[PDB]
Chains A and B, each alone.
Chain A
Amino acid sequence: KPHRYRPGTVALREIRRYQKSTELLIRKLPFQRLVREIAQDFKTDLRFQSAAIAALQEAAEAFLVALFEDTNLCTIHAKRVTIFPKDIQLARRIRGER
C-alpha cells in the first residue's frame, strides 16, 4: 500500500477539492460568461460569489456527464454506434430523471 502525504498546514479535503477543480473540462472563462449570459436576463444588478460560480460549474459538469453515463449504459450493440439526441432522450426516459 502506497504512502500518503499529509501536509501539516493544509487538510487533505481542501487539497481534494482543488484537484477536482483542475479536473473540470469546460474552459472556465466561457463558463463564467455563460453564467453572465443567463444572469443578465434575470437582473442587471446581480452579483455572484466566486465560489458560487465554482459550485455551479462542478455541479453542471456532473449533470452533463451523468446524462452521457445513462445514455452509455442503455446502449448495447456488438459494433459501436454514434450517439444521437434520441439515444439521450430514450436513456433518460429509461434510467434518468422525470
Chain B
Amino acid sequence: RGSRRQIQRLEQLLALYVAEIRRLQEKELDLSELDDPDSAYLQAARLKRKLIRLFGRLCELKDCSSLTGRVIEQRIPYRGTRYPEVNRRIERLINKPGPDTFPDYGDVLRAVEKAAARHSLGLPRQQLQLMAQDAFRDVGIRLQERRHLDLIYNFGCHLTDDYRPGVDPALSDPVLARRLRENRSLAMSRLDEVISKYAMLQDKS
C-alpha cells in the first residue's frame, strides 16, 4: 500500500494536467500557429505524455498493473485447428501486447511449423501451409475488429463526446447534403487516382 497523502497530491496533479489539456484542446489555431513547434496541439501532446508517465508512477505506487482497459488488451482466442499445440501457439502470437501486434502470413506459417516440428506431429508441408492460411485469415479478421473497436471507443475528446449521428446538420439541410454528396464523389475519385498513379508509376520503372 502507498502513502495516502502522496497518492492524493499526485491525483490532484493528474487532474491539473487534465484541465490544462482540455484548455489546450479548445485553442483555435490559425495557419501561422500550425507552422509553430510550440502550438497548442504540440503543447497538449507533450502534456498527455507527462500525464501518462504520472499515471504509470501512480500504478507503481498502488501496486496495480499498467493496464487502462483498452480493447486491444482483450484476448483473442484461437481454437481453429485440430491440434491444440498449434492453436495455443497462434493465440500466443496474436495476443502479444501493444499497438503493433499484427503478424504476417510468414509469422503464422512459422508458428505452425514451429509448433509442428516442436511437438513432432508429423504434418507434411501442404497440410501445414493450408492450416496456416486458414488461421491467418481468421486471426486477421479478429485483429482488425479489435483495432476498429479500440479506435471508435477511444476516439476524440470531451468536445466530441456528445456526438450522435442523428444530429448531423446534413439531415435537415438538402443544400448541405447535396454539397457533401458532390464532395464524396470527388473524394472517391481522388483516392482512386492516387492509388492508380503509384501503380502506373510502378510499371514505368
Contacts and interface: CB of A to CB of B under 8 A. Distances in A.
Contacts of B95: none
A64 interface: no
A13 B15 CA distance: 14
A12 to B, nearest CB: 5
B21 A18 contact: yes
A54 B25 contact: yes
A62 interface: yes
B102 A69 contact: yes
A50 B65 contact: no
Given A15-B55, A48-B29, A50-B25, A36 B34 contact: yes
Interface in A60-93: 62, 65-66, 69, 72-73, 75-80, 84-86, 88-89, 92
B55 A35 contact: no
Nearest to A12: B69
Contacts, number: 174
A76 to B, nearest CB: 5
Interface residues of A, number: 59
A3 B29 contact: no
Contact of B65 (A3, A17, A66): A3
Given A18-B51, A19-B52, A22-B49, A50 B26 contact: yes
Interface in B67-89: 67-70
B131 interface: no
Contacts of B151: 58, 62
Interface in A16-38: 16-23, 28-29, 32-33, 35-36
B170 interface: no
Nearest to A20: B154
Contacts of B40: 50
Contacts of B49: 21-22
14 contacts: A9-B11, A12-B69, A32-B42, A33-B34, A39-B31, A46-B31, A47-B28, A54-B41, A58-B151, A75-B104, A76-B133, A80-B104, A89-B195, A92-B195
